[PDB]
């Protein structure tokens, strides 16, 4: 297939404020589904999330992109295509933990 579903989880989505990159701005009002998809048409993994029919995340994973845990339930990563920093807040450390693990896997496939 051109777009292959791989993994899906839920979280509240945020982006850092453009101006000083320090204040968190909510992007979704609800927790939404955040997923990893493999795009074979472009040969890359993508992090995709829609709030309703509005894509709020469509981040291609690149070899040096890095996911950082900020608390036991929240983590972030920088994205140059959209020129921002995404933050994800999970209901539990186990979910943040698992998301970060998958991130590392597809980062390597990218390299």
Q: Which of 23, 15, 98 is nearest to 56 (CA)?
A: 15
3-state helix, strand, coil in the chain (%, to 5): 15, 50, 35
Whether residue 106 contacts residue 36, with contact meaning beta carbons closer than 8 Å, is answered with yes
In the chain, domain spans = 2-111
The total number of residues written for the chain in this structure: 111
Give the HSE-up count for residue 52: Cα atoms under 13 Å, Cβ half-sphere: 4
Cα–Cα distance for residue pair 83/38, rounded to 1 Å: 22
Resolution in A: 1.7
Domain 2-111 coded CATH 1.10.3720.10: no
Whether residue 87 contacts residue 67, with contact meaning beta carbons closer than 8 Å, is answered with no
Cα–Cα distance for residue pair 28/30, rounded to 1 Å: 5
Is residue 17 classed as helix, strand or coil in its secondary structure?
coil
Question: How many CB atoms within 10 Å of residue 32?
Answer: 19
* Experimental method of this PDB entry: X-ray
Cα–Cα distance for residue pair 91/42, rounded to 1 Å: 32
Contacts with 62 (C-beta within 8 Å, 6 or more apart), sequence order: 44, 107, 110
Q: Which of 6, 10, 1, 3 is nearest to 94 (CA)?
A: 10
Q: In degrees rounded to 5, what are phi and psi of residue 43? A: 60, 55
Instruction: Look up residue 50 and give its two tokens.
Output: 């829609």
């Amino acid at each position: 297939m051109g777009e292959q579903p791989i993994f899906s989880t839920r979280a509240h989505v945020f982006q850092i404020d453009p101006n000083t990159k320090k204040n968190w701005v909510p992007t979704s009002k609800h927790a939404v589904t955040v997923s990893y998809f493999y795009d074979s048409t472009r040969n890359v993994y993508r992090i995709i999330s829609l709030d309703g029919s509005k894509a709020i995340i469509n981040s291609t994973i690149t070899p040096n992109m890095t996911f950082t845990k900020t608390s036991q339930k929240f983590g972030q990563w920088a994205d140059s295509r959209a020129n921002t920093v995404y933050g994800l807040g999970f209901s539990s450390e186990h979910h943040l933990s698992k998301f970060a693990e998958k991130f590392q896997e597809f980062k390597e496939a990218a390299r």
